[PDB]
Amino acid sequence: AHGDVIHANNKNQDIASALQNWEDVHKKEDRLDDLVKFCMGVAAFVTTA
Amino acid sequence: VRKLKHHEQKLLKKVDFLHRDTQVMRTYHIQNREDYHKYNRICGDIRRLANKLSLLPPTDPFRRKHEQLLLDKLYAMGVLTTKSKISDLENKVTVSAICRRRLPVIMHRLKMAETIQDAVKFIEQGHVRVGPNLINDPAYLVTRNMEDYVTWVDNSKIKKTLLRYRNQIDDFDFS
Amino acid sequence: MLRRQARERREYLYRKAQELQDSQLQQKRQIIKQALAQVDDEYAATSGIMDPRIIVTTSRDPSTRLSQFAKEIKLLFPNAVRLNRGNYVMPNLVDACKKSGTTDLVVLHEHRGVPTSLTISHFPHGPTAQFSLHNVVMRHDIINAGNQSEVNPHLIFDNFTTALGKRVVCILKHLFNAGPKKDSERVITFANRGDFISVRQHVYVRTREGVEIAEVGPRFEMRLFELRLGTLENKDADVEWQLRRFIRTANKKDYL
Amino acid sequence: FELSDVKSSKSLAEIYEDDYTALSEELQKAHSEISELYANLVYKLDVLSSVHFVPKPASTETPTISMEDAQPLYMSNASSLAPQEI
Amino acid sequence: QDGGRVGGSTIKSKFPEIVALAIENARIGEWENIITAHKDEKFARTWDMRNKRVGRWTFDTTDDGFVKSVAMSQCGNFGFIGSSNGSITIYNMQSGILRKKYKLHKRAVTGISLDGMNRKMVSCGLDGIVGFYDFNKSTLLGKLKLDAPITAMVYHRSSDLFALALDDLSIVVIDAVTQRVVRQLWGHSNRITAFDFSPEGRWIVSASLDSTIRTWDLPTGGCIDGIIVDNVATNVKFSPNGDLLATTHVTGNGICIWTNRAQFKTVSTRTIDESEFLNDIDFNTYTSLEQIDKELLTLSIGPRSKMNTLLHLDVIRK
Amino acid sequence: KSDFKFSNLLGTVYRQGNITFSDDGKQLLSPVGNRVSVFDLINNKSFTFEYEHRKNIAAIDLNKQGTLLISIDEDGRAILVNFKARNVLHHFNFKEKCSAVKFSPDGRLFALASGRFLQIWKTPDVNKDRQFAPFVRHRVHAGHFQDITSLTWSQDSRFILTTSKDLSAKIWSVDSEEKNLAATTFNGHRDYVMGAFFSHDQEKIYTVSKDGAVFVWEFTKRKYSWRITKKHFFYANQAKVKCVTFHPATRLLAVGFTSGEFRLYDLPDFTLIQQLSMGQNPVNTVSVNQTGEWLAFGSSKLGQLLVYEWQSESYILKQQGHFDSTNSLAYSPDGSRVVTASEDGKIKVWDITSGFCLATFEEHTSSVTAVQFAKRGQVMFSSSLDGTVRAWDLIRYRNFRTFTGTERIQFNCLAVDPSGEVVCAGSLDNFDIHVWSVQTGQLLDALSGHEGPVSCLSFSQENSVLASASWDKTIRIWSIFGRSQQVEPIEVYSDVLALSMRPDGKEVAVSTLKGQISIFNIEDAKQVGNIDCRKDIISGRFNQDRFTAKNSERSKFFTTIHYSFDGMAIVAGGNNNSICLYDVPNEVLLKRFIVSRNMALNGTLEFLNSMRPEVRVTSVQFSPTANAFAAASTEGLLIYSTNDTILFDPFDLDVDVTPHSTVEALREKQFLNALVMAFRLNEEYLINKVYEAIPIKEIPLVASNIPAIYLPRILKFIGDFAIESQHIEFNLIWIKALLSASGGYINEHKYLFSTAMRSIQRFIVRVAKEVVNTTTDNKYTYRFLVSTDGSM
C-alpha cells in the first residue's frame, strides 16, 4: 500500500534509521531460510536416492 | 356401460368412460399401459426434436454435430443399428424398436427363456445377470455391450440344470 | 465373445448385402449421371487412416524354398511378420491373430517345394482372395543382389476394368501401406493380361532426361481363382466370386 | 437470404431506432431449447437404461453469484498466465 | 447328520450351569457362534445366537477332563477347548470337527486366547506356566512360568496385552509380542473374582472377594479408583461401546448397569485406592508451550492461510 | 493401527433441513441426511458427526450455551447430544412428523411445531448423570386448524408465535397467566403466513406472507389490541418468499425466494439494502449471526450453501456439493488435495486441511470415469464416458490436452506413467488399450490381446510396466519400453472387476466377481495368495426384492480396492453396505465398517419390517499421510482416520516404564532414556512433553543415539505434530539432527521409511516454503526500495 510513498520519501533520516533496524532484525533471521533450504534439499536427496 | 341401443346411441355416441397399447402389450408382453404411453410419448418427443433440428439451418456445424450425437447415441443404445440416414430416425424408431430393445425380448431373442413371460419371471427371480450386476426389473433397455455380456447369475438352479442336461457340471466353479 | 463375434459376422453379411443392393442401385442410377451432365466397407473404415499389418504364414511343415520365399514376401511387404505354422490349427490361429488385432493375412501353399497358392484374408471379418501362383522367380534363386530398400513403395496397377477388378485394386491398395512418399524410389507393378496378373519389384530413378528402372525382388504369375466374403477359417461362408473351370467359354471368357 | 412480401410490422422510426441501437437471438433460443430437450431426453434414456438411481438433471435480471469456481478464486489472471503465452 | 438315534432319557431337561463361555460375531447367521462349557462336562455345547437356539455341535475334551476354558476364533471358524488335564483341543466350528490338539500343560488349563491375526495363541493352566504358540504353524513359541497357580486370564487383542488374576491375589499384565510381563498389580486383599480391560485398554476393572471393585490405570500402573460393594460383583464387564459397565453380583436375579462419567468427562489419574481404604499428568493430556525459547520462532495460533488472505485478499475482492 | 475413527464427510455440504449457527457465530451446523456437520469458521475446519440417523434429517436445534443438540427426523426420532463430549445423550421418539424445533432463550424448555399442535417440553440437566426418562413435556397448544409452519420465541422465554398455514399466527405462552395476557391469534392475511416476529421494544409484530406481504401490527390505540400498523410489500412476478430470517437488535430481514433471489432489508424504514441471487433454484434456509454480520443461505436443489458478511461485503464461503455422486476419488501426492469427479462432468477439487472445495472443472460433458495423477503434484487426469480423456493443470488450473480416439470410445479405466510421459485409457466396447504420449498429444498405440472389456489398468511405477485386468478372467502385463513390447497373461478363476498394485511394485491384488482378492508376484507371475470375501459382506435387502438378502448375489464381490502404502493392509469397497480392511501377511481381515444406516437408501435393511437410492462404495483409497483413508460412495466422500490416538498401544513395555518414571528421567536429565520410555509407552501427550522439554544443545546427541527401531516412528510423529505446530525452528533443528544422524540407513530402507518422508516433506512445502518466500520478498523489496534513487 504505502510502498510508493515510502520510496518517494526514501533517503529521509528517521525512516532510514528505522528501516536500518528492520533489516538488522531481518539479517538476524535469515538462518531460517538457510536451514529450510538445507533440510528440504537433503530430504529430497534421501527420498530420491 | 350398457351397450347402448340405436336411438340412444345416435343421441349419445361420444360418451365413454373406459388399441396399439394392448396390441403391443399382447404381442410383446409389455407391462403397463403407461409403459406404452411413456414409449410413445418418447417417440413423439424424438420426432419433435427431429422437427426442431431440421428447422435449424442445414449448413450449421452445431446442427450436424448434435445430429450425429443423437444418431450414434441412439445407435450405441441400440434402437437403430444403422447410422447413415436421417429418415431412419424420422420413421423407423418405434415403440416396437424400443420394445425389442427391452430386456426380456433380448432374453427371448438369445433364447435364454423359451418364452418372454418366463424371461420376465427369471428377471423377477434374479436368475439372470447383466454384465457386472444382476437385474430384477424387465423395464430395461440394454446397451449393446451388455447385450453381449448378459447371462444367468452364478450358482443358479437354472444354469445348473443347463450343465446337468449337458452333463458338464463343474462344482469347482459351483456351476 | 462367441455371441459378440457371431453378431459381428451377421452384421458383416448384412452390410455386404446392403453394399450389394446399393451397388445394383448404382448401376441403375448410372444412366442419369450422363443425362444431366468408392472403397469397400472394411477398407473404407481404414483406407488411409491406419497403417496395415500383415502376417505371412506357411501352410505347414514347409520346404526351405518356401521358407526363403515367404521371407522374400515379408521383404517386399512393409509391416509384414513371418509365421512358421507348426502344429497350429486354422481356427485357433485366426482367432489368436484376431486377439492380437491384425489387418491382413497371407498364407502360402505349394507342391514339392514349389509355391503355387496364396490366400489373403482381411481380419476384421473381411474377404479372402485365393490365388494360384506358379511362375515363381526368386531373388534367392537368381543372385546375391544385396537387399531391398524397404521404403514404402510406389504402386502401378494395369488393366483393371471390371468392378471385380475394382474390388481387387481396393484390396491391394489397402494392403500396401498408406500415404507413400512422392519420391518413393521403389515401385511395384500390377500387370494384368489374359486374366493373368503378374508382378515384379522395380526400383527406379529418373535420368538426366528420362527414367531408368531395375527389376528386382520376385517375378511370377498368379491368378485369383476364388474370392469369398467371409474369412478362410469359415470354409463355408458365401463365396463372393467363384471360377468356372467346367464351362463352355472357359478358355475364352475374360475376368472369369 | 430471402425477403418477405407481407406488410412490415414496424414503422420507419421503429426499424431506424432498432438500427440506431451471438449470431442471432433466434438461433440462440433455438440452441437453448434443443439443449434443454436433449438434456431431458438423455435423462429419460439414462432412467430407462440405468441399473443405478439417477435423479432429474436440473430445473428448466439481477446481480447473481456463481458458487462453483473453476479456479481457486484467489489466483491472479497474470499469475495463471504462462510467460511463454504472454 | 448320520440319522442314528440319540442316547439319553426320554424326558427332557436343561443343560448344566455355564462355567465358561465364548462368542463371536464375524459370521453371524452362518454357523455356530457361542460355545458354552457347562458344569463338570468333558465337552462344551454350541449355541446359535441369531436363531436363539442350541447349535448342532458339542466338543468333547477327549482326555476325560472337564472343559475348564473355551475360546472362539475371532473369525468364528475355530473353537479352542482347554480341559482339566492340560489338553488344548482345537475344533472347526463350521462342521464341529476336531482339527488339532496341543499338549503342554498337565494341570487344568484355566485360560486360552488367540490373537486377532489367528496366528499366536496364549494358554495358561493351573501349574502356573504360560504357553505361547503359533496357530498358523503348530509350534511352541514360548513357555513362561510364574510363581502362583493361575486362576483367570483376560486377553486384549486391540493392544495384544493379556492380564491375569493369579492365585496370589495379583493381576499380572503380560505383553505377547515381547512375550514378557510388563505390569503387576498388588492390593487385592482377597480373591480376584473378575477383571476386565477397558475398550481402549487404559484401565482394568476388577471385582474381588473382599467386596471390592478397583479400577486401575495401566499406563502409570496405579489404582485410580476403588469402591466397596455391598453385593459382591461376580461378573464385571465393559460394554463393547466404551460407555457402560455390567456387573452380576452374588444376589439378585439381574445385572447392574453403570454409566461412564469418564466417557462424558476427563478423569484425574491418582492412586486413591489405599488412600480411601503435573495436573497435565493427572489428566493424561499435555498442552504445548506457546514459545519454548526467545530464539525459537513461532507462528500463528490457528489458521495459516491468513498469509495468502493478506497477500491475495484484494484479488478475492476482484 | 487397525482402529479407525470416521473423521469427516465432504461433499453435499447442505442436504435437508434448517442450517443453524453457533452463539459466538464461529461455527455452523448444517444438516446432512443422516449426520450433522460442524463448521469451525475461525480456523476453517470441517467436522462430521459420527452418529447416524434412522432416515433423512428433518429438524435440528442447538442449545443457547452450546451444550445440547436435538435432531428430529421425519419419524419423531429425536437425538439429543452433548456437544463438548460430542456424545449422544438421548434418543427420544416424538411419534409424529415434527416440523420446527426451537430452544427457549432461557434454555430450560423448548417449543416444537409438530403438526398443527405446539408441543412444549422441559429440559433435564447435562451435569446430571444419565437417567432413563429425562424427556419431560410442559404444554400442548391446539388452537390451530392447519399445520404450524413457523415458530418464534420472544426475547424472554414466555411468548411463542406459532405461524400456521391456516393464515394464522397464534401468540401462545408457556404459562397460564401470560397465556391469558397474550395467547391471541393473528389473521387478516394473504395466502399463507410464512413468519411472525417480535420487535426489539416488542411493541410490533411482523408477519411475512408467502404472497410477499409484511404486516406490521403494533400494540397501539384505536382497550386496544393488534392494529395492523404498517404494510410492506415485495414486488416479484412469480418469486414468492420461501425462507425468512429477521435479526431484531440490528433490525435486518433476509427473504430468500423460489428463484434464487434473496432480498436483504432494514425493517423500520423498509429499505432494500440489497438483493442478489444464488441461481435458478429456490433458496431453502437462511440463518443469521448473533451480531448479525453473517448470513447463511442453503439451498438443496443442487446442494449449495453460501455464508456471507454484509458489512465488509465478503463471501466467507460459496460452496456446493456434487449433484449425483462422487464417482472417483484422488488423493494428492502430498495429500493436501483430494479430487472428486461425478456423473455430471463436474470435477470438484478440495483441500483437506481446510476441507474445502478449492475449485472445479466442467469441460467433460459426460461422467468422468477415472481420475488420476502422476508421481508429481502438478497434473490431474480425467477419463470420461465422453469418448475423451483430459489432462489438466492444478497450478495454472487449465486443461492441457483432451486426448481422444477417432471413434471416441468410452474409456472407463486409465493409468498414467510415473514420470508422466504416457497416458493409457481402457474402454468397454473396444477394450483396446489406447496410449498417448503427453507432449505429442496424439496416441502412440492401442494394445490388443484382451478379449472382452478391460476392468482396470495399473502401472507398476518402479519397473513402470502395466497390468490390465479384463473380464476374460485374465490379467495381462505389458512391458512396452526398451524395444520389448512383450506380454504376460494370467488366467484367474472368474471375471476380475478390481485391480491394484503394491506400492513397492512386485505384488498385485485383484478382486473378482466371486469375492476373492488374489495377490500375484509379477516377476514370476505367480499367485502370492488370495483372501476370501464372500462371507464378510453385509449386503442389503431391497423393498422390491423377491428373494432374501442372504441368497442375493447382489454385491458378493468387491469393486474397488486400495493397498496400504506399507502394502500390508487393504481397504476394499464394493456395491454392499460394507468397507473392509484386510491384512496381507496373515491374509485376514482387520476391520469392517458399515458405511451408513439409512432406510432412505435401498441396500441397508437386511430383513424388512413385516427406483429409490441405493448405497454402494464406488471408490476406496488410503492416505499418503498414512493417518486417514477416504471412500467415495453414492452420498459423497467419507474419511476415516487414526487421529483419535486415545488407545494405549505401547511398545515393549516393562514394569519400571511409567509416565512418572519418564518425568523422573527428564528431571534426571536423562533425555535419551526419557524419550525411549516415551516411545515405549507410546503416548503422544507425554511424547510432546519430552519433545518440548529436552534442550537444543543435546538434540544432536540424543538424535545420534536414538535407535533405528524408534527412528521411523519419531519421524512420523514429528511430522504429524509439526504440521499443527508452530515451533518450526525447533522442529527443523530436530529434522536436521536426525538427517545428520541416519541418511544412508533411510536410503537403504526407502520403502520402509515411505510414510515418514512423505508427510515430512509435505510439511516443509506446506508452510515453511511459503514463510520463507514472504521473508525473501520482504528483504528484496527492502533492498530495491532503499537502493533506488528518489524521484523528482
Sort out which chain C residues have CB atoms less than 8 A from F472's CB and list them: 1
d(Cα F400, Cα F385) in Å, to the nearest integer?
19
Q: Do A32 and F775 touch (CB under 8 A)?
A: yes
Q: Would you call F704 helix, strand, or coil by DSSP? A: helix
| Chain position carrying cell 430416425 | B89
d(Cα C185, Cα C187) in Å, to the nearest integer?
6
Residues of A with CB under 8 A from a CB of F: 3, 6-11, 19, 22-23, 26, 29-30, 32-33, 35-40, 42-44, 46-47, 49
For residue F82, the one-letter residue type is N
> CA C57, C62, C66: angle at the middle one, nearest 5?
70
d(Cα F118, Cα C88) in Å, to the nearest integer?
86
Tell me the resolution in Å.
7.1
Q: Which of D47, D53, D60 is the best mutation test for F, with the most CBs of F within 10 A?
A: D53
| Chain position carrying cell 509416565 | F659
Q: What's the DSSP call for residue C30?
A: G
The set of long-range contacts for F159-167, using a CB threshold of 8 Å and a minimum separation of 24, is F159/F198, F160/F111, F160/F118, F160/F120, F161/F196, F161/F197, F161/F198, F161/F205, F162/F113, F162/F118, F163/F193, F163/F194, F163/F195, F163/F196, F163/F207, F164/F116, F164/F193, F165/F192, F165/F193, F167/F191, F167/F192, F167/F193
Cell numbers representing residue B165 in the block? 442336461
The Cα of D74 is separated from the nearest Cα of chain E by a number of Å equal to: 5
Neighbours of C191 (CB within 10 A): 14
Of A9, A33, A40, the CB nearest to F764: A40
Name the residue of chain D whose CA is nearest to E309's CA. Answer: D74
- Taking alpha carbons only, the member of E218, B2, B104, D59 closest to residue F300 is D59
Q: Do F493 and B173 touch (CB under 8 A)?
A: yes
d(Cα B79, Cα B76) in Å, to the nearest integer?
8
> CA B111, B114, B116: angle at the middle one, nearest 5?
90
CA A3 to chain centre: 16
d(Cα F678, Cα F658) in Å, to the nearest integer?
9
F596 and chain D: CB distance < 8 Å anywhere?
no
E160: left (phi over 0), alpha (psi -120 to 50) or beta: left
Q: What's the DSSP call for residue E17?
A: P
d(Cα F355, Cα F359) in Å, to the nearest integer?
12
Of B49, B52, B143, the CB nearest to D49: B143
Cβ pair F753, E316 in contact under 8 A:
no
- 3-class SS string, chain B: CCCCCHHHHHHCCCCCCCCHHHHHHHHCCCCCHHHHHHHHHHHHHHHHHHHHHHHCCCCCHHHHHHHHHHHHHHHHHCCCCCCCCCHHHHHHCCHHHHHHHEHHHHHHHCCCCCCHHHHHHHHHHCCEEECCECCCCCCCECCHHHHHCEEECCCCHHHHHHHHHCCCCCHHHCC
The alpha-helical segments, DSSP class H, found in F567-683 are 659-667, 671-681
Neighbours of F517 (CB within 10 A): 25
* Strand ranges across the sheet with E256-259: E233-238, E244-249, E256-259
The alpha-helical segments, DSSP class H, found in E127-272 are none
Q: Do E26 and F536 touch (CB under 8 A)?
A: yes
Chains in contact with chain C (at least 3 beta-carbon pairs closer than 8 A): B, F
Q: Would you call F301 helix, strand, or coil by DSSP? A: coil
d(Cα F486, Cα F484) in Å, to the nearest integer?
5
The Cα of E298 is separated from the nearest Cα of chain D by a number of Å equal to: 26
- Taking alpha carbons only, the member of E120, E118, E116 closest to residue E130 is E120
Q: How far is CA F114 from CA B118, F97, F144, F245, F336, in A?
A: 50, 6, 12, 20, 44
E220 and chain F: CB distance < 8 Å anywhere?
yes
- Overall size of chain D counted in residues: 86
Q: Would you call C220 helix, strand, or coil by DSSP? A: strand
For residue E220, the one-letter residue type is T
Q: Which residues of E64-73 are buried (b: 16+ CB within 10 A; e: fewer)?
A: ebbbbbbbbb
d(Cα C167, Cα C126) in Å, to the nearest integer?
12
- Taking alpha carbons only, the member of E155, E169, E150 closest to residue E201 is E155
- Taking alpha carbons only, the member of B160, B20, B153 closest to residue B99 is B20
Q: Do E303 and F729 touch (CB under 8 A)?
A: no
d(Cα F781, Cα F676) in Å, to the nearest integer?
47
Q: Which of F443, F448, F471, F478 is the best mutation test for C, with the most CBs of C within 10 A?
A: F448
Q: What's the DSSP call for residue D64?
A: B
The enclosing H or E element of F785 equals helix F769-787
Contacts of F409 by beta carbon, 8 Å cutoff, 6+ apart: F387, F427, F429, F430, F432, F434
Of A3, A42, A49, the CB nearest to F739: A42
Q: Would you call F310 helix, strand, or coil by DSSP? A: coil
Q: How far is CA F69 from CA F82, F102, F140, F464, in A?
A: 7, 11, 22, 53
| Chain position carrying cell 495399473 | F458
- Taking alpha carbons only, the member of F91, F85, F68 closest to residue F20 is F68
Beta bridge partners of F151: F162
Query: Per-residue DSSP letters for F668-679?
Result: TT-HHHHHHHHH
| Chain position carrying cell 471385380 | C164
d(Cα F36, Cα F71) in Å, to the nearest integer?
9
| Chain position carrying cell 499443527 | F724
- Taking alpha carbons only, the member of A31, A17, A37, A23 closest to residue F779 is A23
- Taking alpha carbons only, the member of F668, F709, F662, F651 closest to residue F688 is F662
Rounded to the nearest 10°, the torsion over CA F692, F695, F701, F703 is 20
The set of long-range contacts for F296-300, using a CB threshold of 8 Å and a minimum separation of 24, is F296/F19, F296/F21, F296/F28, F297/F243, F297/F254, F297/F256, F297/F262, F298/F13, F298/F14, F298/F19, F298/F30, F299/F14, F299/F256, F299/F260, F300/F14, F300/F15, F300/F16
d(Cα C72, Cα F504) in Å, to the nearest integer?
47
For residue F309, the one-letter residue type is E
Q: How far is CA B97 from CA B31, E143, F93, in A?
A: 16, 77, 53
Neighbours of E316 (CB within 10 A): 14
F257: left (phi over 0), alpha (psi -120 to 50) or beta: beta
Residues of C with CB under 8 A from a CB of B: 1, 3-4, 7, 11
